[PDB]
RNA sequence: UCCAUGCGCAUGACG
RNA sequence: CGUCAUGCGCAUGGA
């Protein structure tokens, strides 16, 4: 409930109008200052006795929880109403009531936006920006094209212009709230010049309709006292491959596949995908099946260039073991093909000796063990530990690996995000909290993490941040995590990877240059530029809405037939399908049901083809074992258009399918 | 607390 | 515009 001196001056303009931005580094505790702005605004509104609301917005739920528990309540526990609002907190009360109540709100973004849309539709109780007297944001540097919450500012922008027009038109003018923006260093997006960066910043500011940035320069001394920045550091340090590449070449010869590129990169992957579409556009075999296999192989390569090939053997053991299980489940109610037999036998004839090759070291892994061991010695104990990388699979893999070799012990644990993707077992927010807490105790010495740890997770006191094969903001936040107590950054990758840390330093210089330029600017010219950017953004939104509205026009019941994509085989019609939840599609009418096969290895079985292809899940809804499917695995056959099409999702086409009627299923 | 799914978004790399 | 990897949020349904 007190102001630092450097916080004082920067907060100063916001206290009277001054919709502004703030950027300060980690550790400066910009929540306290924000709270002071809140309390001062509220006290002002009590002095005028008017509606004082704050609608604080974030990108993630965790920060809302943190600030509710620890920042907003303990300083406004006494006076005012507070509530921490999230998509996950099943809350009995609805949003516009906690607008009707709850002078202070902490919230995640799209709650608000959804409520505004319910307004614009008029569906459920609505809300508008007129119910407010202030807005505060965290992480404004996400404010850009089609951001989660940036859309709302465009409405604030749209109505704003109306106000000015109304002042010209009739001159009644509705109020609009003050806007505060907080962030770390905003960074910069896709620049090589100061002008590009400056245009970015002006874009941000007029997307926030701000007035200035108001960074700290006077009281830099106490800041640098609180803020100790660690040392910018760079620390940099067979036949199985060809054994497999020969197989790949044999497979091209088997398939007449001309790569027009090398093995072990994205271009070969993309060519494989395009060929797989075309052979899906042709309904042939040995042409798309092998595109998929070769996709798997190139994945195996690009891990082999970075990972112990034992993990590639794991990958392919998983794959082909599933393949054998698929073909056996097909045979259970039935035989192979020359294609499948060729590929499988080509694999299995080598599989054992290839696993033998896997057990032969002759690699960045050695450099990694060296980099790990050296820090354990210098610390001699009580060494915190962080690792970054790209993927999820890498983390499980390396954790399993490090469990096996040495350890002197630093028990380390993996970490990933949450998303339902990658064909992996994700983690859970609870589990993330558990892990970071154990690290907070230091019981877990080393963390293996993707780019979650850099983002917004409370970590500190650490020293040995690294990079095994990985923008300026990620860099500065990872530097913020490791403190200036014998802490050293490390980067390890085959080698422009140094280029990127260098670029981050370069952008760190450039952003300060642009900040200094814009701050020292005419208020007139500044306002003119920001108005132009606001008009540009608004017209851009109108064009996007025009294109989207013009997009979907057909909305047909049944114009198609869905087919197997390995075998150009009829599977379903357009009218035989039905819908549940207005989300999922399904095919009853057991004429269909005579076709498929079912499998389940470990809560819902999976539906697979007579060719062997995997098509869906035994979705159990309302007591019906609804065989749901995924359009990703299916191909389109219009009666009208000969060309085949494939979408990866239902909403690509506009043509609608009906909602299911269980009264049909009256037995 | 766990699980399945849909939708939207940003970021990095690649064409 | 297309691909991949990563991350985020929201909405459903179930235990
Ligand atoms: Zn089939």
Coordinates of C-alpha atoms and ligand atoms in Angstrom, one line a residue, chain A residues 564 566-567 569 609-611 615, ligand 1:
Chain A
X564 CA -12.1 -44.2 -47.0
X566 CA -6.6 -45.6 -48.2
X567 CA -9.2 -47.4 -50.3
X569 CA -14.4 -46.9 -50.8
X609 CA -11.4 -49.5 -41.1
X610 CA -11.5 -52.8 -43.0
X611 CA -8.5 -51.4 -44.9
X615 CA -11.6 -43.3 -38.2
Ligands
LIG1 ZN1 -10.6 -48.6 -46.1

